[PDB]
Amino acid sequence: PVGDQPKDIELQIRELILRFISNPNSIILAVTAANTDMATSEALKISREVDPDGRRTLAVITKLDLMDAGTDAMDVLMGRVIPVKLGIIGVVNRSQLDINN
C-alpha cells in the first residue's frame, strides 16, 4: 500500500480485476514481463481464480528484449512450465526511450 492506496489495495485491485475476468464471456490477457518469473505471474495467478483451466486466458510475455540475458522462456512458451489452453505468446515493444523517440 503506497501513496494514497489502502492497506488492502492488493485485494481492491484484485477485486477490480475479478469484476471483469469473472465473466466467462471474456478474453483474459495475462500480461507479464519476460525479465520476471513467469511461473509466478500474478496475471495468471488471478486468472486461475475465475478460469482455473485457462479456457479463456491467453498468456502474454512482454519485454522479451529485456529478458535476463542467458535465460529463456522456451519452457514457458512450449507449455513445459505453464500449460495454457489458448497458448503462450511473447511480445516485443517500445521502451521509455523508444516511445519518446
Partner 1 sequence: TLQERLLAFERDRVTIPAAQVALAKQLAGDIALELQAYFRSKFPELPFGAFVPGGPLYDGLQAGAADHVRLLVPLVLEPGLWSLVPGVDTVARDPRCWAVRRTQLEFCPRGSSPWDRFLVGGYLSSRVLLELLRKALAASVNWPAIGSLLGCLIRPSMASEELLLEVQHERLELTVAVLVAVPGVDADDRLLLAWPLEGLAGNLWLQDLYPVEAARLRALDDHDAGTRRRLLLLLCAVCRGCSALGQLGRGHLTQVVLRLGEDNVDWTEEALGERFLQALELLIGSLEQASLPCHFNPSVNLFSSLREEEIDDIGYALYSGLQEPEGLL
Cα dist from 62 to 16, 45, 89, whole Å: 22, 17, 9
Say if residue 40 carries a ligand binding annotation: no
Residue 26 contact among partner 1, ligand GCP, none, beta carbon within 5 to 8 Å by kind: none
Residues 24 and 2: their CA atoms lie apart, in Å, by 32
In a 3-state reduction of DSSP, which class is residue 11? helix
Residue for grid cell 535476463:
68
Point out which span in 7-15, 34-42, 90-98 binds partner 1 (CB under 8 A): 34-42
The total number of residues written for the chain in this structure:
101
- Nearest distance, CB of residue 95 and partner 1, angstroms: 22
Determine if 71 is a binding residue for partner 1 (CB under 8 A): yes
Could you say which DSSP state residue 22 is in? Answer: T
| Chain contacts with ligand GCP (rule: CB under 6 A) | 62-63, 65-66, 91-96, 99
For partner 1, the binding residues (CB under 8 A) are 24-25, 37-41, 44-45, 48, 68, 70-71, 73, 75-76, 80-82
